[PDB]
Design an enzyme around this catalytic site. Structure first.
Site, PDB file in Angstrom:
ATOM      1  N   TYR A  87       4.957  10.341  13.336  1.00  0.00           N
ATOM      2  CA  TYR A  87       5.462  11.474  12.522  1.00  0.00           C
ATOM      3  C   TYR A  87       4.333  11.966  11.611  1.00  0.00           C
ATOM      4  O   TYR A  87       3.176  11.502  11.731  1.00  0.00           O
ATOM      5  CB  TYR A  87       6.733  11.078  11.778  1.00  0.00           C
ATOM      6  CG  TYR A  87       6.695   9.768  11.023  1.00  0.00           C
ATOM      7  CD1 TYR A  87       6.035   9.653   9.813  1.00  0.00           C
ATOM      8  CD2 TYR A  87       7.400   8.661  11.475  1.00  0.00           C
ATOM      9  CE1 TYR A  87       6.040   8.466   9.093  1.00  0.00           C
ATOM     10  CE2 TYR A  87       7.413   7.464  10.771  1.00  0.00           C
ATOM     11  CZ  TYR A  87       6.740   7.367   9.569  1.00  0.00           C
ATOM     12  OH  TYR A  87       6.723   6.188   8.874  1.00  0.00           O
ATOM     13  N   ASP A  88       4.641  12.930  10.744  1.00  0.00           N
ATOM     14  CA  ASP A  88       3.649  13.576   9.852  1.00  0.00           C
ATOM     15  C   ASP A  88       2.563  14.234  10.706  1.00  0.00           C
ATOM     16  O   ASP A  88       1.417  14.321  10.235  1.00  0.00           O
ATOM     17  CB  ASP A  88       3.086  12.571   8.846  1.00  0.00           C
ATOM     18  CG  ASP A  88       3.986  12.315   7.647  1.00  0.00           C
ATOM     19  OD1 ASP A  88       4.872  13.138   7.395  1.00  0.00           O
ATOM     20  OD2 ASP A  88       3.796  11.282   6.986  1.00  0.00           O
TER      21      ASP A  88
ATOM     22  N   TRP B  10      11.149   5.882   8.556  1.00  0.00           N
ATOM     23  CA  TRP B  10      10.891   6.265   7.153  1.00  0.00           C
ATOM     24  C   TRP B  10      11.853   7.397   6.819  1.00  0.00           C
ATOM     25  O   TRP B  10      11.831   8.415   7.515  1.00  0.00           O
ATOM     26  CB  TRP B  10       9.423   6.705   6.954  1.00  0.00           C
ATOM     27  CG  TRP B  10       9.179   7.020   5.513  1.00  0.00           C
ATOM     28  CD1 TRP B  10       9.494   8.168   4.853  1.00  0.00           C
ATOM     29  CD2 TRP B  10       8.719   6.107   4.499  1.00  0.00           C
ATOM     30  NE1 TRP B  10       9.224   8.052   3.510  1.00  0.00           N
ATOM     31  CE2 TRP B  10       8.740   6.800   3.267  1.00  0.00           C
ATOM     32  CE3 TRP B  10       8.272   4.781   4.514  1.00  0.00           C
ATOM     33  CZ2 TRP B  10       8.321   6.211   2.075  1.00  0.00           C
ATOM     34  CZ3 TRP B  10       7.862   4.202   3.335  1.00  0.00           C
ATOM     35  CH2 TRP B  10       7.876   4.915   2.134  1.00  0.00           C
TER      36      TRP B  10
ATOM     37  N   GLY C  20       0.800  -1.246   0.000  1.00  0.00           N
ATOM     38  CA  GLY C  20       0.000   0.000   0.000  1.00  0.00           C
ATOM     39  C   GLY C  20       0.826   1.288   0.000  1.00  0.00           C
ATOM     40  O   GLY C  20       1.489   1.620  -1.017  1.00  0.00           O
ATOM     41  N   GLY C  21       0.778   2.023   1.107  1.00  0.00           N
ATOM     42  CA  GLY C  21       1.388   3.363   1.229  1.00  0.00           C
ATOM     43  C   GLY C  21       0.369   4.454   0.941  1.00  0.00           C
ATOM     44  O   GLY C  21      -0.764   4.115   0.501  1.00  0.00           O
ATOM     45  N   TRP C  22       0.760   5.717   1.139  1.00  0.00           N
ATOM     46  CA  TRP C  22      -0.118   6.905   0.964  1.00  0.00           C
ATOM     47  C   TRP C  22      -0.889   6.858  -0.359  1.00  0.00           C
ATOM     48  O   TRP C  22      -2.091   7.174  -0.346  1.00  0.00           O
ATOM     49  CB  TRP C  22       0.678   8.204   1.041  1.00  0.00           C
ATOM     50  CG  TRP C  22      -0.172   9.417   0.803  1.00  0.00           C
ATOM     51  CD1 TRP C  22      -0.254  10.154  -0.347  1.00  0.00           C
ATOM     52  CD2 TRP C  22      -1.078  10.030   1.735  1.00  0.00           C
ATOM     53  NE1 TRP C  22      -1.148  11.181  -0.192  1.00  0.00           N
ATOM     54  CE2 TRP C  22      -1.658  11.135   1.080  1.00  0.00           C
ATOM     55  CE3 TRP C  22      -1.459   9.756   3.054  1.00  0.00           C
ATOM     56  CZ2 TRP C  22      -2.579  11.965   1.713  1.00  0.00           C
ATOM     57  CZ3 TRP C  22      -2.373  10.577   3.676  1.00  0.00           C
ATOM     58  CH2 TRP C  22      -2.926  11.664   3.008  1.00  0.00           C
TER      59      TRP C  22
ATOM     60  N   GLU D 260      -3.784   3.255   4.474  1.00  0.00           N
ATOM     61  CA  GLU D 260      -3.875   4.695   4.881  1.00  0.00           C
ATOM     62  C   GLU D 260      -5.135   5.367   4.337  1.00  0.00           C
ATOM     63  O   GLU D 260      -5.090   5.987   3.276  1.00  0.00           O
ATOM     64  CB  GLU D 260      -2.653   5.463   4.386  1.00  0.00           C
ATOM     65  CG  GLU D 260      -1.348   4.822   4.829  1.00  0.00           C
ATOM     66  CD  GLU D 260      -0.119   5.708   4.741  1.00  0.00           C
ATOM     67  OE1 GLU D 260      -0.266   6.876   4.288  1.00  0.00           O
ATOM     68  OE2 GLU D 260       0.990   5.226   5.121  1.00  0.00           O
ATOM     69  N   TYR D 261      -6.254   5.329   5.066  1.00  0.00           N
ATOM     70  CA  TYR D 261      -6.459   4.646   6.334  1.00  0.00           C
ATOM     71  C   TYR D 261      -7.884   4.091   6.322  1.00  0.00           C
ATOM     72  O   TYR D 261      -8.718   4.587   5.563  1.00  0.00           O
ATOM     73  CB  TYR D 261      -6.347   5.615   7.523  1.00  0.00           C
ATOM     74  CG  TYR D 261      -5.168   6.550   7.463  1.00  0.00           C
ATOM     75  CD1 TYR D 261      -3.891   6.124   7.811  1.00  0.00           C
ATOM     76  CD2 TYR D 261      -5.323   7.852   7.028  1.00  0.00           C
ATOM     77  CE1 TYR D 261      -2.800   6.969   7.715  1.00  0.00           C
ATOM     78  CE2 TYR D 261      -4.244   8.710   6.924  1.00  0.00           C
ATOM     79  CZ  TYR D 261      -2.980   8.266   7.268  1.00  0.00           C
ATOM     80  OH  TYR D 261      -1.925   9.121   7.180  1.00  0.00           O
TER      81      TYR D 261
HETATM   82  C1  LIG Z   1      -1.993  14.461  12.384  1.00  0.00           C
HETATM   83  C2  LIG Z   1      -2.368  14.029  11.007  1.00  0.00           C
HETATM   84  O1  LIG Z   1      -3.285  13.274  10.838  1.00  0.00           O
HETATM   85  N1  LIG Z   1      -1.673  14.518   9.976  1.00  0.00           N
HETATM   86  C3  LIG Z   1      -2.015  14.167   8.623  1.00  0.00           C
HETATM   87  C4  LIG Z   1      -0.824  13.450   7.960  1.00  0.00           C
HETATM   88  O2  LIG Z   1      -0.633  12.132   8.491  1.00  0.00           O
HETATM   89  C5  LIG Z   1      -0.954  13.352   6.443  1.00  0.00           C
HETATM   90  O3  LIG Z   1       0.330  13.059   5.862  1.00  0.00           O
HETATM   91  C6  LIG Z   1       0.571  11.719   5.405  1.00  0.00           C
HETATM   92  O4  LIG Z   1       1.078  10.910   6.473  1.00  0.00           O
HETATM   93  C7  LIG Z   1       1.226   9.515   6.139  1.00  0.00           C
HETATM   94  C8  LIG Z   1       1.521   8.712   7.404  1.00  0.00           C
HETATM   95  O5  LIG Z   1       0.376   8.741   8.266  1.00  0.00           O
HETATM   96  C9  LIG Z   1       2.282   9.339   5.047  1.00  0.00           C
HETATM   97  O6  LIG Z   1       2.334   7.989   4.591  1.00  0.00           O
HETATM   98  C10 LIG Z   1       1.979  10.262   3.863  1.00  0.00           C
HETATM   99  O7  LIG Z   1       3.121  10.233   3.004  1.00  0.00           O
HETATM  100  C11 LIG Z   1       1.623  11.709   4.276  1.00  0.00           C
HETATM  101  N2  LIG Z   1       1.176  12.538   3.154  1.00  0.00           N
HETATM  102  C12 LIG Z   1       1.917  13.493   2.567  1.00  0.00           C
HETATM  103  C13 LIG Z   1       1.222  14.304   1.497  1.00  0.00           C
HETATM  104  O8  LIG Z   1       3.079  13.702   2.867  1.00  0.00           O
HETATM  105  C14 LIG Z   1      -1.433  14.689   5.903  1.00  0.00           C
HETATM  106  C15 LIG Z   1      -1.665  14.606   4.418  1.00  0.00           C
HETATM  107  O9  LIG Z   1      -2.132  15.892   4.013  1.00  0.00           O
HETATM  108  O10 LIG Z   1      -2.637  15.144   6.556  1.00  0.00           O
HETATM  109  C16 LIG Z   1      -2.378  15.466   7.921  1.00  0.00           C
HETATM  110  O11 LIG Z   1      -3.493  16.132   8.533  1.00  0.00           O
END
Ligand SMILES: CC(=O)N[C@@H]1[C@@H](O)[C@H](O[C@@H]2O[C@H](CO)[C@@H](O)[C@H](O)[C@H]2NC(C)=O)[C@@H](CO)O[C@H]1O
Length: 366
Positions: free
Chosen positions: A195-196, A347, A78-80, A120-121
């Site tokens: 993270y993210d 990652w 999978g992945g994003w 995701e997700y």
């Molecule tokens: C706190 C939260 O929910 N943040 C969201 C981010 O998780 C999300 O980014 C995406 O995170 C994934 C891991 O959970 C990564 O696999 C994915 O690459 C990444 N997306 C990008 C575009 O980098 C973002 C996406 O907009 O939303 C946040 O709200």
């Protein structure tokens, strides 16, 4: 005792010119290969040009196993960008059988030791192309089961144990949308993507992986649980056993440009979009930060002692970088040990060529 779970990216073998031969296999316990795609409810090769053809990353991974018998390689389905196939796969026992059987077929054909479900997700969240139905909540548990059964059966046939793992969101919406207390029994371990938490999806700057909640961060719609300790704690309470909870860590950084300095050298300030990047705007390899920016060329390093996070600010261009500093990673490695957790995940491994973070985690957990 502790796991060290490295994501390797197939597209490493293009511009990045970082192949499985370049990995320091002594510094990990698992490689998760990102990614296998889903086509017609079946786990499929993601990139024939670098996976099972061309640069032949799969051959190189098998060569590595021979050299390191202890190593376990897993295929990350999978992945994003490739999650849209999960809802269908999960929703009927027919489609679940089809999936799990394809996944068993995939790992036997390419010499993999198991499967990493990167969905995701469930229910909500993900890319513009992503598909959901509310029954994902239960279907996630069902799909996990089919896989566990098919991997266990095929394992017994082949004289081999095949691991099953998953990557889970840092946002506790994931927990309200799954049965982690049920599905935790069927996973060998669980890769918490801690993270993210903050990125260029926000017009204002923030930390990619702050250790704890900073109340001084109050920009609109960012939760007080968008941190590493909140997420781990949410996953322990939701029912993930400590010993199975693997703590995610980023080896990339995010940047904005034109961030107002305010009284915080750029931190939690309105900016003017994406800053400088390595392979694309606003996303930096740690190698790039280390070599080109870390207290260099107008970028100075600041430390927030509430969040336990470092950031760079360039006052001239108002550029703000969030990145994983050794000082913060050490606090996270102490936390792992003290809470009895499953180890660290990260990652991704091509992003730290000097192995400054990669060596700190290996040296602390192995
Ligand atoms: C706190 C939260 O929910 N943040 C969201 C981010 O998780 C999300 O980014 C995406 O995170 C994934 C891991 O959970 C990564 O696999 C994915 O690459 C990444 N997306 C990008 C575009 O980098 C973002 C996406 O907009 O939303 C946040 O709200």
């Amino acid at each position: 005792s502790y796991r060290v779970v490295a994501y390797y990216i197939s597209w490493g073998a293009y511009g990045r010119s970082y192949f499985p031969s370049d990995i320091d296999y002594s510094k990990v316990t698992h490689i998760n290969y990102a990614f296998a795609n889903i086509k017609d409810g079946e786990v499929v090769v993601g990139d024939p040009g670098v996976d099972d053809g061309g640069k032949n990353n799969f051959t190189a991974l098998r060569k590595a196993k021979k050299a390191h018998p202890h190593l376990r390689n897993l295929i990350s389905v999978g992945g994003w960008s490739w999650s849209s196939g999960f809802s269908d796969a999960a929703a009927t026992p027919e489609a679940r059988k089809r999936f799990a059987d394809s996944a068993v077929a995939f790992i036997r054909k390419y010499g993999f030791d198991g499967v990493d479900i990167n969905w995701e997700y469930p229910v909500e969240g993900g890319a513009e192309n992503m598909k959901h139905r509310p029954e994902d909540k239960q279907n996630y548990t069902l799909l996990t089961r089919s896989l566990r059964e098919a991997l266990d059966t095929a394992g017994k046939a082949d004289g081999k144990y095949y691991e099953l793992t998953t990557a889970v969101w840092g946002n506790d919406k994931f927990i309200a949308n799954t049965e982690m207390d049920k599905v935790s029994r069927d996973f060998d371990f669980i890769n918490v993507m801690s993270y993210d938490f903050n990125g260029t999806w926000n017009k204002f700057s923030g930390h990619n992986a702050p250790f704890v909640n900073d109340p001084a961060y109050d920009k609109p719609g960012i939760g007080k649980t968008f941190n590493v300790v909140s997420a781990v704690e949410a996953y322990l309470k939701a029912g993930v056993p400590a010993d199975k909870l693997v703590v995610g860590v980023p080896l990339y950084g995010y940047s904005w440009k034109g961030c107002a300095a305010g009284e915080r050298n750029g931190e939690y300030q309105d900016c003017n979009g994406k800053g400088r990047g390595t392979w694309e705007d606003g996303n930096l390899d740690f190698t790039d930060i280390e070599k080109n920016l870390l207290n260099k060329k107008g970028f100075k390093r600041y430390w927030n002692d509430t969040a336990k996070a470092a950031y760079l600010y360039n006052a001239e261009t108002g550029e703000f970088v969030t990145y994983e500093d050794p000082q913060a990673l050490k606090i996270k490695l102490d936390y792992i040990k003290s809470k009895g957790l499953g180890g660290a995940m990260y990652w991704e491994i091509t992003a730290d060529r000097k192995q400054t973070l990669v060596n700190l985690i290996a040296d602390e957990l192995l």
